[PDB]
Amino acid sequence: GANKTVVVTTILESPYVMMKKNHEMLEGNERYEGYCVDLAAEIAKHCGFKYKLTIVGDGKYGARDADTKIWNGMVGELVYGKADIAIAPLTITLVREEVIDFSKPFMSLGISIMIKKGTPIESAEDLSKQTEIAYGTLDSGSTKEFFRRSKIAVFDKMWTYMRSAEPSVFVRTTAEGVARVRKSKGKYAYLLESTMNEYIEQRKPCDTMKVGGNLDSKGYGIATPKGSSLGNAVNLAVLKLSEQGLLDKLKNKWWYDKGECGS
Amino acid sequence: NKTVVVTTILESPYVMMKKNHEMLEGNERYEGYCVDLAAEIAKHCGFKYKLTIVGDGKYGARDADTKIWNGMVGELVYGKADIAIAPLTITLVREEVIDFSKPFMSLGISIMIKKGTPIESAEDLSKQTEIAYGTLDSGSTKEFFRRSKIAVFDKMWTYMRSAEPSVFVRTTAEGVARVRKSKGKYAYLLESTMNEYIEQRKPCDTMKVGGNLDSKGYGIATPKGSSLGNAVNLAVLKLSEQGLLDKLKNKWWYEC
Ligand SMILES: C[C@@H](CNS(C)(=O)=O)c1ccc(-c2ccc([C@@H](C)CNS(C)(=O)=O)cc2)cc1
Ligand SMILES: N[C@@H](CCC(=O)O)C(=O)O
Ligand SMILES: N[C@@H](CCC(=O)O)C(=O)O
Ligand SMILES: [Cl-]
């Protein structure tokens, strides 16, 4: 039928999507800025559609409840028909691929470790062999599922500890994880994606560090409901943007160009 | 069902002839990362398969004149093979004619020098002429330079395409040999995965310099609209999540 405005679900997560200074004076898409805002604009341009950015209601990436088998987060928006497309740092995973489509990845990352500087930890190994320094992950996302599902010894041991720790080591948002690392005098380390880790490492007060190698290797993709007519074009747009070097530029713009911890 | 025809390419350590292969037969002739991968994929998708080395020994490019596709890509496009399991780069032009799974490995274009060569970056290469440099024929690296609007890469392209003698090579091994036999006067542009594998092998006389010039992935390819596509993609994701892709990389990139 006639062209319709495309509903883009996304998540407030720096530096992917952030409230512009003066957002209280702005409306619609103008309220926001960031890597995924820029990406959304480029994708819409290359696929020839109009769109409306909408922050996911429950503020989550997406997990399926093991009881009700209901999906929440951005994945839920797509599965239940609330949004037409998701443009966010949304990790490509098997369980998600089974219910939604993903474009080829637009960004690579791996699970990694964030510490307050000087913390005596340099690996997942180290974390698992001690109990003084607590550690956890984001709720309702791909990192928690990674530990829950892992059959690798060190990671299995970390999960056994995490899932029962008290008080809870899990946080509802990345910002909550960061604050907890920053305020815990070295007694909390945070497991998050290297992209977010690296972004925070360049933010004031420059008191956090990525340590160790990545625990795994994967990517973010743009998601659409299964069998959506947008999928193909969006995949091509991502490949074109990648090959033009636009994704590389966008990353430097939002991570490094105006980093706050020196050159 | 049918025996799935797998096209692939002799490229270490992805696919290599085993020692004594001449008395061996069929799939047992070969070993390497993609050989193991093919076995895992087949097991997870429930098919039997026959590994075959691509006839012209190429990855895949479209002729600008004829617009015919060669290499593994051509074999998919013209129905000679059902699936390609090789270090085949996901690209826009290819994706327009065949299907790719989500990537099973990451890589970027990179620079290989003979140790001691006074070069640290692509920019260095482009600002001089004592040291010649080139790429593989009929693959994504050559197209990369052909299409780049980025100044440094565009300058390298301009030099490489008119250089005499030719700086382009038919196989990765000929590029590596060329770097080794050229007394520092030839540098080779190739994917970081292959660069790093070679760097760890004797005679340990080559080196990767600079960062990767780009960032991309290898994918498993099927003819456009193949029924095999979906299952293979779920297989790659499961293998990735189970840590198996990481294990295979550690095994084949285990001299120096
Ligand atoms: C820079 C962009 C370019 N993306 S593109 C489509 O041009 O290739 C990029 C992002 C991610 C990767 C990448 C490659 C391989 C792997 C496997 C280890 C896992 N693969 S998966 C889909 O299950 O996460 C993960 C991520 C490569 C490139
Ligand atoms: N990108 C992740 C969220 C971040 C994390 O889990 O660390 C996801 O899609 O679930
Ligand atoms: N992986 C490349 C071949 C090697 C190269 O181009 O450097 C391709 O699929 O074309
Ligand atoms: Cl032999």
Domain boundaries, chain A: 4-109+219-258, 110-218
CATH 3.40.190.10 fits B2-107+217-254, yes or no: yes
Under DSSP, is residue A54 helix (H, G, I), strand (E, B) or coil? strand
Tokens of A65: 């409840």
To what resolution in angstroms was this structure determined?
2.2
**How many Å apart are CA A236 and CA A192, to the nearest integer?**
29
Residue nearest to atom 10 of ligand 2 (CA): A141
Are the C-beta atoms of residues B215 and B144 closer than 8 Å to each other?
no
- CATH class of the domain at B108-216: alpha beta
Closest-CA distance of chain A to residue B234, Å: 7
Domains B2-107+217-254 and B108-216 share a fold: yes
Per the CB < 8 A criterion, the answer to whether A16 and A79 are in contact is no
Residue A13: CB within 6 Å of ligand 2? no
- Using DSSP bridges, classify how beta strands A188-193 and A111-116 pair: parallel, antiparallel or unpaired: antiparallel
In sequence order, the 6+-apart residues with CB closer than 8 A to the CB of B35 are B14, B15, B27, B51
**Burial bucket for residue B189 (CB in 10 Å: 0-12, 13-18, 19+):** buried
Among candidates B90, B148, B240 on the partner chain, residue whose Cβ is nearest the Cβ of A218: B240
Going by the DSSP 8-state scheme, the letter that residue A254 receives in this structure is I
Tell me, what DSSP letter sits at residue A166?
A: S
Sign of CA dihedral A118, A124, A126, A129: positive
Look up tokens 């702005």; give the residue: A26
**Cβ distance A34 to A254 under 8 Å?**
yes
Measured between its terminal Cα atoms, the distance across chain A in Å is 52
CA pair distance B221, A143, nearest whole angstrom: 29
The superfamily (CATH) of domain A4-109+219-258 is: Periplasmic binding protein-like II (3.40.190.10)
Residue A223 Cα to chain centre, angstroms: 13
Pocket test for ligand 3, best of B104, B141, B193 (most atoms within 8 A of CB): B141
Helices B33-45 and B228-241 pack at an angle, to 10 degrees, of 110
Query: Three-state SS for A95?
Result: helix
* CA A59 to ligand 2 center in whole angstroms: 12
From the CB of residue B76, how many other CB atoms can be counted at a distance below 10 Å? 26
Taking contacts as CB-CB distances below 8 angstroms, the residues of chain B near A108 are 106, 215
Domain A110-218 in CATH: superfamily?
A: Periplasmic binding protein-like II (3.40.190.10)
**CB-count burial class (<10 Å; 0-12, 13-18, 19+) for A98:** exposed
Whose tokens are 């497309």? That residue is: A85
Q: Is the CB of B59 under 6 A from ligand 3?
A: yes
Q: How far apart are CA B217 and CA B192, in angstroms?
A: 11
Q: Is A142 annotated as a binding residue?
A: yes
